[PDB]
Amino acid sequence: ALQTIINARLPGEEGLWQIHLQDGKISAIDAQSGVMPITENSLDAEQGLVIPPFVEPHIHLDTTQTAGQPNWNQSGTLFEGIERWAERKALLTHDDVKQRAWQTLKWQIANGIQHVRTHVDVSDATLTALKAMLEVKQEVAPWIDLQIVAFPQEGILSYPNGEALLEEALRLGADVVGAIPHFEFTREYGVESLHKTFALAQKYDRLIDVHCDEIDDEQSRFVETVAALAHHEGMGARVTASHTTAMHSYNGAYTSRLFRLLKMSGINFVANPLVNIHLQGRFDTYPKRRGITRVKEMLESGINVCFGHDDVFDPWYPLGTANMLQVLHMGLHVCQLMGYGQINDGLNLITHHSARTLNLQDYGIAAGNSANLIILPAENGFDALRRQVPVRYSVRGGKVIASTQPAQTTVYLEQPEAIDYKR
Amino acid sequence: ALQTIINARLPGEEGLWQIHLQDGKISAIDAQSGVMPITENSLDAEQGLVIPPFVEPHIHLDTTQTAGQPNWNQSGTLFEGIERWAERKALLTHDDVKQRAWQTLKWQIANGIQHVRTHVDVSDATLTALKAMLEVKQEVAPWIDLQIVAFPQEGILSYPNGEALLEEALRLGADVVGAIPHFEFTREYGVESLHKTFALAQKYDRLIDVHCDEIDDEQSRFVETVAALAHHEGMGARVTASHTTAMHSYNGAYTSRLFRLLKMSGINFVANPLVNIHLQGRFDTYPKRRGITRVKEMLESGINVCFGHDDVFDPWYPLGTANMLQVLHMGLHVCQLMGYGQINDGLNLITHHSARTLNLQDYGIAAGNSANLIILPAENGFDALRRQVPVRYSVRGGKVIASTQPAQTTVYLEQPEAIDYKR
Ligand SMILES: O=C1NC=C[C@H](O)N1
Ligand SMILES: O=C1NC=C[C@H](O)N1
Ligand SMILES: [Fe+3]
Ligand SMILES: [Fe+3]
């Protein structure tokens, strides 16, 4: 029966703050002039940072926890990954998908993630994973708001009954329409697939999230069609272009021309640093390109960009604990957003920007919003990132749904000394 | 008064093992056929992984904890970094250096690091940091064996009295001779500086560790002189080429020719992933090169290569907690050593390979060696890396010098559930 969050630090704000809770919502936020005493019904943030929940804007829960089954992706490429997944997709069962999705979802709850957008492969006449994921969505609702993207992994026009299956997925309840233009047989199929994707999103009033130009091909420019169609339909807010790794390889003049449209369109962008650094640059010898989209430039231009984990122990990525601060750490390094302020502001890439990408309507520490927030045992975004701190408490609807008792390290010198890695 | 380490897993070995300790050394190692019972004087590894101590083969303890003083490195380049450091170097004091070096050394002890090689800038007539570091070396000896590299940061031939100061540093006790050929005014000064570096190492019987070709210049090939001189003097084991980031930009034909010499010479290589990904590629627009040396190819050719953290919160790197598993994580991603076996074998890059780089004579879990070892709460190298586990216990001379009580995470679902991120 929590009534208040006290001694809280807030990004971009000076001092400590008190967050009053009432009926599962935030009733008011007031600044404090000093440290407040703890008491019953008060959750002490202990001068730690309080922020809305971490968000996972791009993950594949249907493939999670399947790395090496039946075989391993030896080349470390997107293309072999799809082929290795195809082998596993043929062996899927309802319970298998639910068990694995839930295992990763629990790690996400433990990591303060209360909003997740999972893509689900719908290039499968049986739609096995989709049916399973729709049940998981209902089951996990008390802890995570899960969005499902109908993702035509093998193409819309390049796979038998691809468009029909994509629409069937929407009729069954998928929240977002997906696409993968660079994987279609031809550039023309790629462009046409986007017109079909947008028509379905308008027909069913759904969001859009395209696996867009995930390839080191300077000629892969499907992103301009995604942005142009969004601008034409006046629906930028509901549209997302995931990856756009090809943008890392575009010449600067085209990119500058393109950026005007990206900003005017208002669409969202997702970069997946852990997976992008691994799968991109695989066709170069030396030097080897990084392959992440132009994150730094998007931020400088006011274009909404955010980070996703993409994969957790599957054909496209053998690692992960579904930790967003870890995803952010990799992104800041590869994108060279290493200035103090850029690092400190990094939290935006895994909180607010991701919420906008998911078109969330109830997100942020503000009066009237649901009492969904997490507490990090750190002074600010920089500190949280540097020390890769766990989530001390995760609060949803005004109730604690996860907590982590921090590790305790001691070094035995002339006398025992506690080490917290702070300066 | 520990007498045994029980229930230990060892890299590359099947089953559990018992490590008997006697007089501060490992007396014997025996395989177990099942789980052994705990008892007084027995340290239970609890089926966790036991390995010799982590090693930090390349760090700058004289500059650590000084990021932003007096100003920040705004460009994120090696060159501005040196210039920003120059401003701080002018404000150094004995106690200042000792305090900061010790702060980072404590984090290293907490992180199971018992061997550290620190470079110390000796392009300073007062040799302030060097005098301070020599005292720190004596002070920290019970927990860490610290090697000091006399590092002529501003060049040997390109800085006033550079060679004289370098030799003075050796006469005062520095363990390793350093150099920085790519920073010298001319290619000729670069080559000549290496002849002088080798002559000093032979005159004083010291090791060598060159900041070698840390620049995105395909024409920076000082590494061939380092390797050739080592081969000529028959001293490969005592020589290290740090960085060699220029190798990331060499054409393949020259690299192939060069590799024959690298292998024949027997010299060591250090890659610094966290810093290299940040400082390299800064002169590219898009695409942007990764800039780490050819780690994967060195491993395939049997060339000894290892990883260092390089910097901890200073002019060249604003982050860090001096954690080697974190350094390894970045290196595996950027170097694309992402196959299951490559990741699992990754521990070698921060243990055995680094010990060879430091020319250590008492290292490894073997009968007769000092009882210096650490325990990771993980099943193998892959698991330790994936979950970024802390060091449960660090043992030196048969005594516990550091321990970490792991964090405890719980998610409150229909019932409370402990989350350990394992599969
Ligand atoms: O096409 C893809 N499928 C799964 C992961 C990666 O994001 N790309
Ligand atoms: O020349 C250098 N000084 C400090 C760090 C970096 O390793 N390079
Ligand atoms: Fe994806
Ligand atoms: Fe260095």
Swiss-Prot record, chains A, B:
Activity is lost under pH 5 but not affected up to pH 10. Zn(2+) binds at residues 58, 60, 211, 310. Its EC number is 3.5.4.1, 3.5.4.-. Keywords: Cytosine metabolism, Hydrolase, Iron, Metal-binding, Zinc. Changing residue 243 to Q: 200-fold decrease in catalytic efficiency. Homohexamer. PANTHER family: CYTOSINE DEAMINASE. Catalyzes the hydrolytic deamination of cytosine to uracil. Is involved in the pyrimidine salvage pathway, which allows the cell to utilize cytosine for pyrimidine nucleotide synthesis. Is also able to catalyze deamination of isoguanine, a mutagenic oxidation product of adenine in DNA, and of isocytosine. To a lesser extent, also catalyzes the conversion of 5-fluorocytosine (5FC) to 5-fluorouracil (5FU); this activity allows the formation of a cytotoxic chemotherapeutic agent from a non-cytotoxic precursor. This is Cytosine deaminase. It comes from Escherichia coli (strain K12).
